[PDB]
Design a protein around this nucleic acid. Structure first.
Lengths: 155, 34, 125, 97, 236
RNA sequence: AUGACCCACCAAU
RNA sequence: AAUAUGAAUUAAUGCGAAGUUGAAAUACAGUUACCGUAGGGGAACCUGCGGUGGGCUUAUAAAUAUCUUAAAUAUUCUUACA
RNA sequence: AGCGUUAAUCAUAAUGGUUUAAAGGAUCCGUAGAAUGAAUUAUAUAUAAUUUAGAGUUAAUAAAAUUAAUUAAAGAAUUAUAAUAGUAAAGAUGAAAUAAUAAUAAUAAUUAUAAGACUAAUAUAUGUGAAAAUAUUAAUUAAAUAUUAACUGACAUUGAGGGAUUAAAACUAGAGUAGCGAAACGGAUUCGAUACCCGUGUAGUUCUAGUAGUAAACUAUGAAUACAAUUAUUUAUAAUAUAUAUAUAAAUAAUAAAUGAAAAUGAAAGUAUUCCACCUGAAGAGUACGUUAGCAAUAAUGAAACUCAAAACAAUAGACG
RNA sequence: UAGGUAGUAGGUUUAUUAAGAGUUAAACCUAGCCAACGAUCCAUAAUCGAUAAUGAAAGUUAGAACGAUCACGUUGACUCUG
């Protein structure tokens, strides 16, 4: 998958959160789906739906080779006390510099230790980790002891 | 600063005058068979 | 600076503190002989007759020095021990000398800061 | 404030030119920050912080900057929770040092 | 401006002062803005369907949802440029309230410009108590206007008493004319009769038409008294 | 206060 | 072959508490200034050419205005009312 | 039982930047890049196999634009030059001087030859070009548009070095040479005036083949991609039941947010990702020297010693013109 | 310091060697090999740690001292010994 795409998704979500947009669209790919699903499960998003370029789908539309170019993920942005719940979405691994951490170092990051210039996890922040072609929480990666590329630090 | 750039102008112009004097030394006995 | 550009080497300006008293070639006090001796005018806003010498050094590098204290024994051809330090006013003396070695003396009645100005506990009867 | 002594989480608010980078510290770590941040922290209550000011340490700007950080980039635990639709927890008391 | 914070956050602000000591007695209103919390979300919420033309805002024609070569005799299979130009702003963009009745309104007024000249009660009175049976081009309260003709053609196209919009409107167009024709006679009858029954009139339509006009002549006559003459001296 | 000096003007779109 | 040190003479530059001549720049700085280049000049500089604004957004009138119930009705109106 | 000071070392900020303060390459093409880069699935994190969103290619329909090179034309004037008739001044300037002005009959006039450069309005450089640049006309050649449709199947993002183009001046040949105008010389002004002003006016400005490769080559802003709130105008363009009010793009002008030392930037100087170039106090210095290239002027490359705690930018008052 | 390299680059076959290899010596092929991710050339320097110093950490410095490695005992070369 493409971290460049992920970088564009992370910047797009930050821009939409700053302008207080309720609903926005991101490219339909497996990476963006797993990324948005983790944000939804962690309560950063209000909704995650399939759609076209025009809007979220009302009824279930099958994804075919003919329609794949028009398909988007529609994501509901969450706001609480006139503030965005997704305030910052920054890449840790860049396209030019990928950061793979062992489980022990991911555990040290969760325990308040700085590793390879990655600041320790703070309360209410999320770090997404890529292990075995899946995206999950940094804590989830440690729980499965799955060493893999790091990804985004949501706050 | 334009004034600072102008000073270059005075300096390049001054060096141009030196170049004219150096030009006499150039193309002379020094740059031929030596 | 893109990483590739840093990987090549394009980073923080490393501050190597160039020596200010190089002629003491990487060594504390060096000794020398007072050639020319003169009094000089200090670049203003300061004005006072500055007392100094154009000492030569063992490393055979000529030096302009400054004589501290109020009273000196600068006799052309004396041998002294040159030290470090700027003369701020004298726009040239980048090396000072030690009032307390070689032929240089120790200011008289020098009552305080005697060490820097050369003097033994003025003893009394 | 977190546990009535330090900030909630490491911050990096950039006020004008001053780029403050304060980090919360373990209970005990005294007040270790720029003189100004110390007196603000002395009067605010923060008695366990640590940080540094980069581009432009504009004394006064540091002060406006610091109180701005405390109110802008220091979301309390409750907010993080109510908003995300979840409930974050405190583990240091669950150990009772 | 920029979504401000110190506007809908007064209770949070006062609460702090109330808990510390900056305040001693709570601002009376304190409770009210607690009972009725302030809407704080200022989200540019999205739209999904046009409130009027019933159109939908949010659909894409997946190609499979199509098979007839376009009029341009051609079976399109690959999605087209606009058909892939992320149109998210369109959802937020407020849709146009298009109404065919508005076209009929303009059409009637174009065909009958004197109706526009006719005074209309644009001022809307309690629109709530206005249920109007429109099988007839007349209603108690609502006066006669081309608007009535429009609301009338609706029955003929809703109930379907007639056929298409053009035919429907005309059926009522002649209905209107009659009411207007009878009114014209009624108008004259009042006078003629009243004229032939002890009636005196201080000023008529011809009278305002002359007095005001003659009044204007006062100004013009005096004006040319300076213009024409001033030029004689200006040229002599 | 440091702090003896300052020098140029020519005629219009 | 290379490096280093010397050389009559000669070049540039730096510093200096108060010498000389002119007044190039900053105001429309009294020829708009600079840029590239060329020529000329005691010296700042002057001049030719193209370029730039880091100067002209420094931008501020062709003057002319139309009636219908002037009211006992409009106006008054405080739960309306009815 | 050390304290100084000096001499070193470590720390004390890149958790930087480059429109305007050091600090974007003249421009683009494009090689390497141990540079980065679509999708889907399936293997053990690379293969294979699929996909069409990038990026391409070929039509067909729209609609026209000339941006290059070359060839062929047009035009107002200018000088000069006779012809002509006309008389005494002309012309220039703040005002005046002069020059080959004019009693050799001038200037003005009106005809008439010749020679050159240039190209008004339109005309907004809107635009068109990579950037240089670029609006007298046509001819040829070539590039450049939108939208569908067929295909291709990530084929790319842009790039060290290299190559290509590269204003004005300059240069080397050859022709040309009206006007302009370095230099020159003369007349002014002035205290002085090798200036501004004025008169002649040569190198040059033109072409042709070169050479050279620098400009405030500036939007003082490298290229690419994804994204973000409005309005008004261009305007492209589809559509409508063309002449309407609509949907798209594109540009231009005001802004929101955001960023910012501020000035202000405003779809970038915002949010992000990728790649290249470049900066690390001021002077000394883009100097010296070496080396390469050039017919040359020069161009690129590019130090150190010595000396300071200075030096630079945006916003503010105030004095000044 | 931008081109360097000719035993150089590799191949094959001999000499010697405890022994592979242009390692030498030898013989004969081929045309290489290295290089702007810095070759060749020049300059400087003994190297290092579970040693010492500095800092928050990355690091940064040192090399006296502890200890590890090297190299030399005035220079050069060679020879025996072993």
């Amino acid at each position: 998958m493409s971290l460049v795409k992920l970088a564009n998704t992370c910047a797009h979500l930050q821009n939409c959160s700053k302008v207080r947009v309720a609903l926005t669209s991101i490219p339909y790919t497996k990476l963006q789906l797993q990324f948005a699903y983790n944000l939804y499960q962690q309560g950063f998003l209000s909704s995650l739906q399939k759609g076209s370029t025009m809007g979220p789908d009302k009824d279930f539309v099958e994804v075919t080779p003919d329609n794949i170019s028009t398909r988007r993920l529609w994501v509901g942005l969450k706001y609480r006390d006139n503030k965005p719940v997704l305030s910052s979405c920054k890449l840790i691994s860049k396209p030019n510099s990928r950061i793979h951490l062992p489980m022990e170092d991911m555990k040290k990051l969760c325990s308040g230790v700085t590793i390879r210039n990655i600041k320790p996890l703070q309360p209410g922040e999320l770090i997404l980790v890529r292990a075995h072609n899946n995206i999950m929480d940094i804590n989830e990666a440690i729980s499965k002891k799955l060493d893999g590329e790091v990804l985004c630090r949501v706050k | 600063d334009s004034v600072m750039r102008k000073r270059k102008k005075k300096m390049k112009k001054h060096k141009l005058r030196k170049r004219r004097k150096r030009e006499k030394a150039e193309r002379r006995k020094l740059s031929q068979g030596r | 600076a893109t990483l590739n550009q840093i990987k090549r080497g394009s980073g923080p300006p490393r501050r190597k503190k160039i020596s200010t008293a190089p002629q003491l070639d990487q060594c504390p006090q060096r000794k020398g002989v007072v050639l020319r001796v003169m009094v000089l005018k200090p670049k203003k806003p300061n004005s006072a007759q500055r007392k100094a010498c154009r000492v030569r050094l063992t490393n055979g590098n000529v030096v302009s020095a400054y004589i501290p204290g109020e009273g000196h024994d600068a006799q052309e051809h004396s041998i002294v021990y040159v030290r470090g330090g700027r003369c701020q006013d004298l726009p040239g003396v980048k090396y000072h000398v030690i009032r307390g070695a070689g032929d240089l003396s120790g200011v008289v009645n020098r009552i305080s800061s005697r060490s820097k100005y050369g003097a033994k506990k003025p003893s009394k009867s | 404030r977190y546990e009535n002594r330090t900030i909630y989480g490491d911050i990096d608010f950039r006020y004008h030119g001053v780029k403050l980078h304060l980090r919360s510290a373990k209970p005990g770590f005294g007040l270790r920050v720029n003189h100004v941040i110390f007196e603000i922290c002395e009067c605010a209550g923060i008695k366990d912080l640590s940080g540094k000011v980069y581009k432009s340490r504009n004394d006064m700007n540091i002060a406006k900057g610091t109180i701005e950080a405390f109110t802008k980039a220091q979301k309390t635990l409750d907010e993080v929770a109510l908003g995300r639709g979840k409930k974050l927890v405190d583990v240091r008391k669950v150990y009772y040092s | 401006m920029k979504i401000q914070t110190n506007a809908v956050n007064v209770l949070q602000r006062t609460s702090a002062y109330l808990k510390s000591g900056l305040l001693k007695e709570t601002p009376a209103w304190y409770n009210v803005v607690a009972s009725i919390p302030p809407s704080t979300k200022f989200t540019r919420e999205p739209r999904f369907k046009n409130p009027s033309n019933g159109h939908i805002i949010g659909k894409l024609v997946d190609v499979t949802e199509q098979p007839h070569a376009n009029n341009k005799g051609l079976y399109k299979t690959r999605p087209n440029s606009s058909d892939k130009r992320v149109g998210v702003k369109r959802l937020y963009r407020p849709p146009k309230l298009t109404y065919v009745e508005d076209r009929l309104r303009s059409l009637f007024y174009k065909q009958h410009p004197w109706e526009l000249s006719r005074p209309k009660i644009l001022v809307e009175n309690e629109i709530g108590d206005e249920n109007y049976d429109w099988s007839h081009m007349l209603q108690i309260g609502r006066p006669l206007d081309g608007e009535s003709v429009i609301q009338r053609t609706m029955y003929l196209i809703k109930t379907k008493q007639y056929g298409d919009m053009v035919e429907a409107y005309d059926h009522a167009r002649y209905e209107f004319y009659a009411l207007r024709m009878q009114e014209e006679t009624e108008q004259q009858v009042a006078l003629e009769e009243a004229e032939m029954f002890g009636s005196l009139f201080g000023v008529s339509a011809i009278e305002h038409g002359i007095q005001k006009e003659q009044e204007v002549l006062d100004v013009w006559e005096k004006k040319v008294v300076e213009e024409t003459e001033l030029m004689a001296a200006r040229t002599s």
